Amino acid sequence: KRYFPENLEQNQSAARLVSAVKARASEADISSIHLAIAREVSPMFNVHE
């Protein structure tokens, strides 16, 4: 993962921001990504939420 600049992850005053980015940074999964890209073109029948 390359979410943070070097040192900023281990910086003590950054911990709120780092906790936040960790709260949003889902682990990469080929199925989820391939789907995320593929779905951009695929027809949608049930409205997405």
């Binding site: 390359r2 943070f4 600049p5 900023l8 910086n11 005053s13 950054a14 709120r16 921001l17 980015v21 951009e40 073109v41």
Partner: protein, 99 residues
């Protein structure tokens, strides 16, 4: 809008950066297509420049706006002041990663 300009200007950060391709190959194949003028919005064009890449540059202006906005964010807590600073660094970092 007359007085929501920071809001509108941030909303422009959402404007899509690609183009509306016509589905010429599929119209040629007589593939099924419910629209009478088939089209799909491709997310981004390829880099016609030799070095500059329009997409990374747009994200540069986006992170520029967002860092200016994080910086213009007043807070009470000391820790909120701290993260207000650290987020600007993280923004700048995402900018390079996106490039």
């Amino acid at each position: 809008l007359a007085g929501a300009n920071t809001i509108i200007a941030i909303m422009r950060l959402f404007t899509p950066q690609g183009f509306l391709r016509t589905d010429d190959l599929a119209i040629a194949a007589n593939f099924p297509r419910a629209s009478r003028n088939p089209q799909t919005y491709i997310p981004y064009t390829n880099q016609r420049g030799t070095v500059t890449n329009e997409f990374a540059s747009r994200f540069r202006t986006i992170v520029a706006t967002l860092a200016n906005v994080v910086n213009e964010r007043a807070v009470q807590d000391d820790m909120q002041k701290a993260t207000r600073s650290c987020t600007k660094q993280w923004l700048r970092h995402l900018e390079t990663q996106f490039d």
